[PDB]
Design a protein around this nucleic acid. Structure first.
Ligand SMILES: [K+]
Ligand SMILES: [K+]
Ligand SMILES: [K+]
Lengths: 91, 91
RNA sequence: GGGGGCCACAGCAGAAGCGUUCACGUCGCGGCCCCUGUCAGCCAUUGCACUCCGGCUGCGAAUUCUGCU
RNA sequence: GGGGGCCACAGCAGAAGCGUUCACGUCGCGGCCCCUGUCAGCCAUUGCACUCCGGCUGCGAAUUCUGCU
């Protein structure tokens, strides 16, 4: 069940928000245009990120190519987001 | 063998040199005048400190009173210094 | 960093030395507390969101002198 | 933050913002590459000194303009 948005967890929770978004953008921008990267460090949402790609093909390539990739010395676990991100559902 | 200088190890190695010196001074100056606090973060000397008291009785009181005291969530391990500090030997 | 409370202290002006600062100028530099943005340490969390928001603890910078009343 | 290399850049005058800053004013805010203070993540280290000094990885302060010539 592919999706425009990939769900990444098992992220290093010590990395700050602005730095985590910039590093996630640096390693995921080669798969295609990124519309947004959503990161929160609250108890519920820490260690996780949502990367919204402009095209589902980019998300599929990113999920297959970056699965288990070490990122701040922790392997990224990548799934498709279970539901459409708000911006995707509105366009 | 009460020495002017107490040797403290099992110290939190993530604490930076200036903060470690100020915090060690806050709890040990209660026991008497401190002549110097020697802290190095090199591989050999990290997690350790030398607190030099002006009088030997202060070092004995500081040792008996602060043995095992939680310090940055690690129990302080205090001994007398095996040899005199350079500044004490020259006095 | 911010906001209050005690206990000092005759006022105003000035010089220098410091503190903060890439540096310079303004500014600030008596003791003890309390509250609070950030930051750090430890604990807890493997969590599917479109969002301020887990807990505890700690850091909370810097004095001499000279005029006038 | 600093030190270098390679290109790009006409002067005067302003407005807003940003960066550095306890906060203002001065100052600074084009691109790429290399080295590096610091900082951060991971790994290793329980160590008796009077001192630069373990390894690897990452970030690398800040502007679009605006008129006149
Ligand atoms: K974790
Ligand atoms: K996160
Ligand atoms: K140390």
């Amino acid at each position: 069940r592919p999706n425009h948005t990939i769900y990444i967890n098992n992220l290093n929770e010590k990395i700050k928000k602005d730095e985590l978004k910039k590093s996630l953008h640096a390693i995921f921008s080669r798969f295609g245009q990124i519309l947004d990267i959503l990161v929160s460090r609250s108890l519920k949402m820490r260690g996780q990120a949502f990367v919204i790609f402009k095209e589902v093909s980019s998300a599929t390539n990113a999920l297959r190519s970056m699965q288990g990739f070490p990122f701040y010395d922790k392997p990224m676990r990548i799934q498709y987001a279970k539901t459409d991100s708000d911006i995707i559902a509105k366009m």
